[PDB]
Design a protein around this ligand. Structure first.
Ligand code: IZL
Ligand code: CDL
Ligand code: IX7
Ligand code: 3PE
Ligand code: DGA
Ligand code: HEC
Ligand code: LYC
Ligand code: FES
Ligand code: CUA
Ligand code: CUA
Lengths: 331, 25, 54, 154, 63, 102, 129
């Protein structure tokens, strides 16, 4: 909403545990949530009161001590009051749906003009990020950076058909991967390292999701948003692109998988690290110039933590984890 | 109810390296 | 209409070879199953032994 | 019951002659360490040294020895993080292609046979700039080109 | 009124026995048993409260 | 890696020849060939009545009707480089009978 | 209803036609022999203890069943009153017959109520006299 929550302890209570959020539409979703919770609390107390009245006021022992007799008034129908009480929730959900449409449409609109677009690949069980396009302001070359790898993506387009011929699924091979974008600047998540995507502050950013394997989901709790990543998103008629108007503050933020994908569904964490806009140019020029260098080396080049400080990788041994120290020491 | 002589050894099997005789060349 | 005891693909007997499914005939399976379920209790008495299959 | 914390599929190692050293927490791992000794008498040490030091302290294999005896190897580049130095005898090393994409490097080896026996096990001592790694390895012949050899009676 | 006092008091120490053990042991299997002891204490607390509820407002008048 | 954690039987210390061990194939329960060598669990298995012998714990039974360990054969290479039996079984192999000691 | 060889016809309707009642001592003896055998099962060459969990659970439940079958405890029938329910000496009136006859629980209804049930009092004045 354009109107902020009550704030204070009332806002904290109404929050009620949501992260504050780090984007404009995150603020909008939080405000809408707070006011919806206000209305919900009104309804909740104003009906729990009637049940409590039944518990304490409408008891039988009281009315029999008062001499009311063995039975009450035996009223059954009050049609005007019934119609009024039917009309009330109609108007409540109607006026709620109006603001729901407002906030939803300003969230989902794909017209935010990205400066950065990152292709994201979900696979069992880790994340792989790849910078797809970068505006000339942040790109190394002054002109816009385009990251699609010609040879590796050519392999993807060649995988569509004719492995000496099976082609069952609508004329394509069952193992098609032409929907995945392969980029030359990539960060690859492993069981030994939590992947970290590096993003700037105060730029419209775009995410292009896809999934090598079963369906996953991308969830950043600080965006207050999550989107499902599917294999062949075009075939599913699923929208695989979503844009954030900007991120408003720097920092490291955990992001999780919110879709049941398999055995190691809990181990599939990543981190989203938001850095000063001037440092992002250094990061991308460093990764481009000497591609053999790892992601951690680039983060050292910035001058921040080489590894995800938000979440450390899980211990991969099925017996050592019994004593609760299931955290790997990255360094 | 287990055989009397079926006893595990005290020896801890430090490696006993092996070789074969080489040709004079 | 139904094959029974297709000996031609079992090969001749030699004491060093065995198959996974090597049960006796159906009417003997009970006395096989007994040998399968006995918990290996064996007695040793000096120079003598009562095996677990007694 | 089979899907518990102790599981049969999880405890398995590769079906190879080469021993291995190092946990996931150790800086440098040696995989598939074996003493090869072809039927023609030539010998060497097959192994793969993988660097995973999170400190990014790139190493260089200073030396390898079998029972204290030297093994010849040359042109070993430093191994930075997430890189593999594959080592094998030259004849076997020629059978596989060096990958132009990825960090792998191929290096040849050879050692004079002091009389090692097929079947037995011998210690192998690696020393890199950052430290030494010891591991027992078996002695065996290289693998035949599959499908070419027949059982010959004489 | 009635047993509800003692049935509460017996619980109040058992619950205290549970949570104490919970803050003693680390993350371990025995922490699960500590949780069970703590929950048993809570159950006996509510059991005392429910017998108190029955005594306050009986609805099976004749024994 | 698995030859490290072998337990030797008292008196059968030097029977192996490096990685090579040599057990009797005749089951100690009723004498079916055992013959089902699980390559990872390292359990020699008998299909007749499901006895399991730990190949690392000197062939001692671990499951099934069998009560007694598989006897072991000592082996060694000859002058020419073939494998030969370096001795006789020290223990009566096959199923047990009444007068068999242990 | 006669008792044949220790069992009553009411419990075993064909008590006179065959072998019906095993003595409870026999049931106890068989159960205890079974428990002894199943506890012996856990002295074999098996290594794991999941086997032990299954055996111990089943033997514990066996012993529980055998102890209750040994003593065969009982509880009394509770004599409380919960609600408008009435004690055992009550006699239930046939409310339907009363409804269809205007007698008993439906007797002596006033004129207004008789009209309220679509019954003209003129056809009923002698019945309530
Ligand atoms: C209560 C009292 C009864 C009662 O108690 O039972 C009496 C039982 O008596 C008969 O058994 C006795 C004895 O009990 C057996 O333990 C013994 O085993 C019999 O000798 C055989 O083994 C001897 C070796 O044994 C010792 O070693 C075994 C391991 O062996 C290896 O290691 C040894 C080292 O020590 C070596 O020496 C040996 O060579 C072998 O080594 C090879 O193997 C290794 C591993 O593979 C390799 O590493 C090596 O290098 C190498 O290769 C241990 O496991 C044993 O425990 C033991 O310690 C050998 O020395 C012998 O030559 C022979 O082979 C011995 O027989 P005997 O001489 O007949 O007995 C005396 C007497 C008794 O009456 C009989 O004969 C028996 C028949 C009576 C009953 C039958 C009923 C009728 C049957 C049916 C009903 C149908 C008709 O004689 C007579 O006729 C007496 C005549 C007068 C009376 C008439 C009647 C058996 O027949 C049983 O059925 C019988 O119930
Ligand atoms: C002290 C120990 C108890 C005692 O008093 O023992 C002496 C006491 C002496 O006799 P008793 O004093 O008259 O008491 C007898 C009963 O215990 C008194 O009680 P009961 O007579 O009620 O109990 C009878 C019970 C007593 O016995 C037992 O409880 C058994 C032990 O026997 C049975 O129930 C009959 C068991 C029959 C088993 C064989 C069944 C064969 C079925 C074949 C079907 C076809 C299969 C075909 C093949 C498969 C193909 C499908 O009991 C015994 O000697 C028997 C039990 C020991
Ligand atoms: C419904 C309830 C289901 C409970 C959850 C399912 C999992 C069962 C469970 O809890 O198992 C424990 C886990 O370890 C198992 O191995 C045991 C040790 O842990 C392990 O470190 C050792 O390595 C094992 O030792 C040897 O064995 C290995 C192969 O086994 C070899 O590598 C090697 O030789 C090794 O040295 C050791 O093996 P045991 O056979 O001794 O122990 C099994 C047993 C141990 O627990 C108990 O005693 C509990 C006592 C209470 C009884 C009741 O647990 C179970 O099954 C029973 C769990 C009880 C659950 C009941 C709840 C009641 C619900 C009401 C219906 C292993 O199976 C893991 O998969 C498993 O997750
Ligand atoms: C656990 C702690 C609470 C235990 C109950 C204590 C209160 C109590 O005894 O309530 C009795 C009441 C029955 O009604 P009544 O006898 O009229 O009493 C209220 C007026 N004196 O009890 C009730 O009316 C209970 C009805 C269910 C209330 C559910 C509320 C959610
Ligand atoms: C009918 C089957 C009887 C088996 C007796 C085994 C005795 C034995 O060889 O017992 C020997 C064995 C040791 O005893 C044990 O395992 C103790 C349990 C034995 C069986 C108790 C029932
Ligand atoms: C876990 C999520 C896995 C993925 C993804 C892949 N494999 Fe795997 N592999 C896995 C296990 C648990 C095991 C051991 C159990 C077994 O079946 O052997 C393996 C084993 C192999 C082997 C056997 C090695 C041998 O010495 O014989 C091979 C050759 C192998 N795995 C290859 C492989 C490849 C190439 C994969 C991706 C294309 C792959 N596996 C996926 C677990 C997992
Ligand atoms: C060859 C020919 C001719 C034919 C074929 C083959 C054969 C010979 C076969 C035969 C068979 C037979 C005879 C069989 C028999 C069997 C029997 C009799 C058995 C019996 C058994 C018994 C038992 C095991 C028992 C048990 C018991 C018990 C456990 C009990 C218990 C009790 C309790 C617990 C109480 C309570 C109750 C409940 C819980 C239920
Ligand atoms: S013959 Fe091997 S288990 Fe019986
Ligand atoms: Cu996932
Ligand atoms: Cu997931």
């Amino acid at each position: 909403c354009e109107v902020a929550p009550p704030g204070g302890v009332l806002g904290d209570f109404l929050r009620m545990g949501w992260p504050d959020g780090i984007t404009p539409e995150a603020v909008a979703m939080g405000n809408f949530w707070s006011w919806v919770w206000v209305a919900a609390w009104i309804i909740g107390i104003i009906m729990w009161g009637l049940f409590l009245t039944a518990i304490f006021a409408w008891g039988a022992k009281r009315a029999e001590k008062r001499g009311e007799g063995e039975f009450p008034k035996q009223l059954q129908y009050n049609v005007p009051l019934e119609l009024v009480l039917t009309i009330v929730p109609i108007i409540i959900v109607m006026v709620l749906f109006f603001f729901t449409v407002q906030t939803q449409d300003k969230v989902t609109a794909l017209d935010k003009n990205p400066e950065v677009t990152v292709d994201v690949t979900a696979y069992q069980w880790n994340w792989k990020f790849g910078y797809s396009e970068i505006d000339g302001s942040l790109a190394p070359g002054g002109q816009d950076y385009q990251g699609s790898d010609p040879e590796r993506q050519a392999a993807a387009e060649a995988s569509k058909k004719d492995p000496s011929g099976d082609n069952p699924i609508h004329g394509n091979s069952k193992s098609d991967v032409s929907y995945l974008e392969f980029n030359r600047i990539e960060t690859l998540g492993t069981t030994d390292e939590i992947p970290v995507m590096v993003l700037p502050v105060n730029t419209p950013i775009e995410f292009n999701l896809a999934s090598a394997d079963v369906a996953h989901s991308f969830w950043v709790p600080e965006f207050l948003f999550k989107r499902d990543a599917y294999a062949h998103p075009e075939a599913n008629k699923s929208q695989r692109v979503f844009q954030i108007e900007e991120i408003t503050e720097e920092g490291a933020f955990v992001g999780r998988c919110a879709e049941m994908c398999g055995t190691y569904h809990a181990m599939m964490n990543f981190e989203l690290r938001v850095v000063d806009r001037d440092s992002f140019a250094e990061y991308i020029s460093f990764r481009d110039s000497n591609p053999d260098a790892t992601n951690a080396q680039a983060l050292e080049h910035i001058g921040q933590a080489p590894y995800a400080t938000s979440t450390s990788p899980f211990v991969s041994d099925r017996t050592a984890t019994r004593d609760g120290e299931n955290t790997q020491s990255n360094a | 109810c287990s055989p009397p002589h079926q006893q595990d050894s005290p020896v801890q099997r430090t490696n006993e390296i092996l070789t074969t005789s080489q040709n004079p060349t | 209409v139904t094959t029974i005891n297709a000996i031609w693909n079992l090969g001749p007997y030699n004491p060093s070879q065995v198959s996974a499914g090597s049960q006796p005939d159906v009417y003997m399976l009970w006395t096989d199953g007994a040998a399968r379920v006995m918990p290996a209790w064996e007695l040793y008495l000096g120079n003598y032994t009562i095996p677990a299959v007694f | 019951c089979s899907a518990g914390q102790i599981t049969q599929t999880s405890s398995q190692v590769a079906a190879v002659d080469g021993n291995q050293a190092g946990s996931a927490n150790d800086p440098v791992l040696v995989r598939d360490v074996t003493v090869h000794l072809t039927t023609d008498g030539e010998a060497g040490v097959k192994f793969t040294a993988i660097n995973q030091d999170t400190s990014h302290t790139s190493h260089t294999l200073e030396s390898v020895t079998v029972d204290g005896e030297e093994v010849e190897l040359d042109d070993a580049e430093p191994i930075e993080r997430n890189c593999s130095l594959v080592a094998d005898i030259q004849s076997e090393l020629d059978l596989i292609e060096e990958p132009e994409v990825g960090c792998i490097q191929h290096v040849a080896t050879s050692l004079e046979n002091p009389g090692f026996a097929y079947g037995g096990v011998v210690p192998v001592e690696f020393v890199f700039d950052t430290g030494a790694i010891t591991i027992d390895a078996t002695v065996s012949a290289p693998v035949l080109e599959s499908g070419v050899e027949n059982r010959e009676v004489g | 009124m009635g047993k509800s006092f003692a049935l509460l008091v017996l619980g109040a120490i058992i619950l205290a026995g549970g949570v104490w053990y919970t803050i003693e042991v680390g993350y371990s299997v025995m922490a699960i048993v500590a949780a069970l002891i703590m929950a048993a204490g809570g159950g006996i607390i509510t059991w005392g409260l429910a017998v108190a509820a029955d005594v306050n407002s009986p609805t099976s008048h004749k024994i | 890696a698995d030859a490290e954690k072998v337990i030797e039987r008292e008196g059968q210390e030097s029977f192996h020849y490096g990685d090579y061990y040599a057990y009797s194939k005749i089951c100690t329960h009723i004498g079916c060939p055992t013959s089902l060598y699980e390559a990872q669990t390292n359990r020699i298995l008998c299909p007749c009545h499901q006895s399991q012998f730990d190949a690392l714990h000197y062939g001692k039974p671990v499951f099934g009707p069998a009560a007694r360990a598989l006897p072991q054969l000592p082996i060694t290479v000859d002058e020419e480089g073939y494998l030969i039996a370096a001795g006789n079984f020290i223990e009566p192999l096959g199923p047990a009978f009444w007068e068999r000691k242990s | 209803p006669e008792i044949y060889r220790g069992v009553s016809t009411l419990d075993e309707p064909s008590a006179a036609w065959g072998w019906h009642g095993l003595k409870r001592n026999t049931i106890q003896l068989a159960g205890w022999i079974s428990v002894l055998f199943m506890l012996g099962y856990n002295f074999g060459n098996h290594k794991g203890h999941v086997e032990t969990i299954w055996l111990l659970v089943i033997t514990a439940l066996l012993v529980i069943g055998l102890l209750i079958h040994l003593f065969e405890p009982k509880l009394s029938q509770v004599r409380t009153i919960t609600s408008r329910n009435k004690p055992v000496g009550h006699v239930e009136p046939d409310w339907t017959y009363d409804q269809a006859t205007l007698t008993g629980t439906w007797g002596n209804l006033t004129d207004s109520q008789l009209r309220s049930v679509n019954i003209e009092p003129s056809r009923v004045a002698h019945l309530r006299a």
